[PDB]
Amino acid sequence: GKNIQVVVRCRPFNLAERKASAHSIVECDPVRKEVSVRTGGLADKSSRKTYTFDMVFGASTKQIDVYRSVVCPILDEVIMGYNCTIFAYGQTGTGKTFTMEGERSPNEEYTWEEDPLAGIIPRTLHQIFEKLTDNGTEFSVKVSLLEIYNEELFDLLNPSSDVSERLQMFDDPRNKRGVIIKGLEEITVHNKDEVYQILEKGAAKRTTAATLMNAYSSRSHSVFSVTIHMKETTIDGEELVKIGKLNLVDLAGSENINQSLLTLGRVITALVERTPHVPYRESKLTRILQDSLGGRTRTSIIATISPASLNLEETLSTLEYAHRAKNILNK
Numbered sequence: 001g002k003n004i005q006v007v008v009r010c011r012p013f014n015l016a017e018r019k020a021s022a023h024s025i026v027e028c029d030p031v032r033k034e035v036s037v038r039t040g041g042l043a044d045k046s047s048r049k050t051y052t053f054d055m056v057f058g059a060s061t062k063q064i065d066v067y068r069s070v071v072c073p074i075l076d077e078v079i080m081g082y083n084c085t086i087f088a089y090g091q092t093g094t095g096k097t098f099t100m101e102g103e104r105s106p107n108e109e110y111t112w113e114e115d116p117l118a119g120i121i122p123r124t125l126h127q128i129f130e131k132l133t134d135n136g137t138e139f140s141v142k143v144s145l146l147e148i149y150n151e152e153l154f155d156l157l158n159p160s161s162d163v164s165e166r167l168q169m170f171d172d173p174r175n176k177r178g179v180i181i182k183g184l185e186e187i188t189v190h191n192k193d194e195v196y197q198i199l200e201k202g203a204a205k206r207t208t209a210a211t212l213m214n215a216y217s218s219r220s221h222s223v224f225s226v227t228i229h230m231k232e233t234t235i236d237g238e239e240l241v242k243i244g245k246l247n248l249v250d251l252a253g254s255e256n257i258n259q260s261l262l263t264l265g266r267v268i269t270a271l272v273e274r275t276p277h278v279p280y281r282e283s284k285l286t287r288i289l290q291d292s293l294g295g296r297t298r299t300s301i302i303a304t305i306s307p308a309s310l311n312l313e314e315t316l317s318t319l320e321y322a323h324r325a326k327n328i329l330n331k
């Protein structure tokens, strides 16, 4: 029906890299949707590997650029009453969290609503209220933040429990491409002015998780879901009741223990090789997101890479992985 769309985003060099006068081994050509990597040698003469994707974003790409080109189109589909998922995949330190969540500009220069460093999640929540409050639509927004570490599930938005309490997952007797996560809390976001504090609470609880679990920020998978219940009444009088859900997934670092990460790779292989048996059941992540992998959910993957020569091997691994994913078909 529809191939999973894959986009690549290369981050810029940081301070420590700039001062060292580092030479980028990555060249991005958005118009041609290609990414080229210097696999050995220098700029005078050398070999390179090139890959074509659905979209390519170089180091000069700002958060708003990513939102306008990839997220906006997807959010519109969600608002039409469909389900969508966006994965962030890549080596630790390449920008998965920066892309999915973003961060705050230093010294309280901007409000969260205007911060140029804000990522996909905050921009999406803000825009949902902007677009639906604008037109004549009755709506409700609910969010949840589920995280997976060592194949255990945690609810990062429940203010009544601590990160030591794991959640139980069961098969949904009703629908077969889904599961039931007992205890997972869904928080109602009444208005745009309740967004930041809800996101902050999740961030604070995540800090306690990092203290209890080793390399939590690198080894955990985060699934932020936003569900929108709408009752739209056209200027003529017809009412259209629809429900849309968007899953924003920040995957564990791909650098080479993580059953969900290993299984995701195996699921993709089975899907692209057209193998009858797809191992969805082998991990919590793939059971939870089964409909996003060869299912009926519109899925996109943002593969993040580094431009530093020090990360050549992992950069190539990420590109090869992302290129293969382009052949997965959903409906």
Ligand SMILES: Nc1ncnc2c1ncn2[C@@H]1O[C@H](COP(=O)(O)OP(=O)(O)O)[C@@H](O)[C@H]1O
Residues within 6 Å of the ligand: 010, 011, 012, 061, 090, 091, 092, 093, 094, 095, 096, 097, 098, 099, 103, 304
């Ligand atoms: N596109 C980008 N533009 C500017 N800085 C970035 C970008 N991507 C990542 N960074 C910076 O690079 C570092 C890597 O961040 P992070 O998002 O945490 O990576 P990851 O989640 O993949 O481990 C951070 O200090 C972040 O601010």
Ligand SMILES: CCOC(=O)C1=C(C)NC(=S)N[C@H]1c1cccc(O)c1
Residues within 6 Å of the ligand: 100, 101, 102, 103, 104, 105, 112, 113, 115, 116, 117, 118, 119, 121, 122, 196, 199, 200, 203
């Ligand atoms: C305490 C600092 O928090 C953050 O930067 C963010 C949090 C909690 N949660 C998400 S999803 N993204 C970050 C965020 C939220 C709003 C505006 C921004 O520019 C960055």
Ligand SMILES: [Mg+2]
Residues within 6 Å of the ligand: 096, 097, 098, 217
């Ligand atoms: Mg991260």
